[model samples]
Target: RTVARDITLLECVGKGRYGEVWRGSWQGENVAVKIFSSRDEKSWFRETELYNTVMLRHENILGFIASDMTSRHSSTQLWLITHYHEMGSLYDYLQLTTLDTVSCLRIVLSIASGLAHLHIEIFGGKPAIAHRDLKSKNILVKKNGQCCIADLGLAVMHSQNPRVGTKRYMAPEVLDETIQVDCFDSYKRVDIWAFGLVLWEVARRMVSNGIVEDYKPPFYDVVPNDPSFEDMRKVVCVDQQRPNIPNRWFSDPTLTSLAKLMKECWYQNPSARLTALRIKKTLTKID
Candidate 1:
C-alpha cells in the first residue's frame, strides 16, 4: 500500500465548532483538509477509523484521501484529507442560486444514491452505515452539478449513539427519543427524514412556471436561527409542524412528485418513511 503524502495548506475555506477546513495541495492535486480542534479529537478518530478500517468509498460520498496526526509546537494536530469541491456545501450553493428541474433532480437523486450506498450492507464488504447527522451543511455540491455526502463524524454502523444528529434535521422519533435504538432500521429512517428535508430545500429552489421560491432551511419559519434542542422539540414534536409545501408546487408536475416524496420522508412513524433506494427509484422516474 502507498503511504499518503503531506499536504500543503493553501487557504482556509471554512470553520466551525469542529475545526477549520483548508484547501490544500497534495501531490499537485487540490484537497480539503479538516484540522480538528482538541475538543473534536474523538470525532477525527471515528471518521478516520471508518475510512481506514471500514474502507468506505463511493462516487456520491466524499473521497477520503488520508488521515494524519502531527505535532504542531506543543499540541498535536489531527487532519482528515478529502477531495476538494470549489462549489462548497449544498446549503451555501442553494442560498446563492436557483435550480432547474434537471439540476434539482440531479442533486436529489445523487444524494439519495449516496445514502442508499451508505445504509445498505454489502455481503463480504463494508458494514451498513448510517449517517446520524444528515443535513445540507454536510453535503457538498460538485462542478458536475451532482451532490456528495460528507462529514461522517457522527455516523454509526451496527452500534448506536444516543442524542446524536442535528436537531433541525432530527426525525420526530429522534426528537421524542422514542426511536428503537436496537434496530438498525431506526437509524436509516432517521437519515431518510433528513433526506426529505434536503429534498424540500432543493425543490424550493427549483424553477417552475417561471417561478422559484426563496431558499430556506428546514423549519426556518417555525424555529429561530440557531435554534435550541427545546426549540426544535416544541416545533417538531409538540406542534407537529413541518416546512410548508407551497400551493405553487401543484402547478408543476416535477415539484408535485417531489412534494409527495418529501411527504413520505417526514412521516411521523419512522417505519413509514421511504427507503433511500425507493427515493432514488422515484427520482429516476421523475427525470
Candidate 2:
C-alpha cells in the first residue's frame, strides 16, 4: 500500500539486531516505524497475524497502524508502523528519570492492566494472550505518563503455541528449560515473572524521602552484558538469587508493597506467582 512510502523517516530512535526504529511523519502526524531485517521477517509476519486475530485496541496496548513491504536498492524491506511515543521505551525512560511514588505506582499499575488484558479472555471476543517477549524495551512510555505494551511477535494465544526470549527477562523455568508448554497457564506464569522484574526496574527509580536508587536491570550485579542462558540459570535457579530490594524501599509504603509483590513473582514455583489480574487489584488498592 501507499502507506509505506507516504511516511517519511525522521530520526532513528533505536537500532539493533532487529533493525532500526524511526520516528516518521505520516500526514504531519508522527509515527514510529520499525524496519525489519531479513532474519526478522518471521517476527513481522507473526505480529501482523496477531493484530488481525483480535481487536487488540486498548489504552495500555500499543497501537498498530500499518505494516508494509517495499523495494529499495532492489532489496526487500519489511516495516511495522505504530503510534509514536516521544518518551521512548521504558528501558530508556527509567535510566535518566526519577519518579515520585504516585507516578511510580501509576506506571506499574498501567502495565499490570495491560498484562491482565492480554492474559484474560473474553468469550466471543478477545482471546487470552501471553506475551512471550515481555520486557522493558518492549514497552513504551507516553506523554500522559502511562506505558503501553509492545511487540507481539512471540505472543501466544490458547489456540497458539511459541521462545527463549530476552535472556535478561527469562524466567527461571525458561532458563532451566522447565516451562510446561502443554498448559496455557505455563506461558502466563512466565509472563508474570518478567512483569515482576519490570516492576523492580521502575520501582527502583521512585523517589522517596530524598532518596532514589540508581536504575539497574534485574540481575545487573551478577550477569555480564548480553548474559548467556547458563549465566541466568546459575543466578535465578541454582543460586536462587533474586534482584536485591534495598532497605530504602521500605521508607515508602508504596515501594514496600511493590517489594512484597515482586518477591512473590520470583518464587521458584511458577504457579506461585501472582496472576496479572491479581497484581492489578493490588495496585488499585495502593494509596
Residue-level lDDT tens digits of model 2 in 120-211? 98886788999998899999998998999998888888743123499989998888988887899999999999999999999989988899
TM-score of 1: 0.95
Candidate 1 local lDDT, 1-287, one digit each (tens): 99767689999999987899999998899999999888788888888878876877788999998888987888998999899999999999999999888999999999999999999887868788999999999999999999999988888886322236788898888788899988989999999999999999999999988888898999988888888888988988899898899999999999999999999999898888899999989999995
Model 2 vs. true fold: TM: 0.95
What C-alpha lDDT, on a 0 to 100 scale, does residue 76 get in candidate 1? 94
Candidate 1 overall lDDT versus native: 0.90
lDDT of 1 at 207: 90
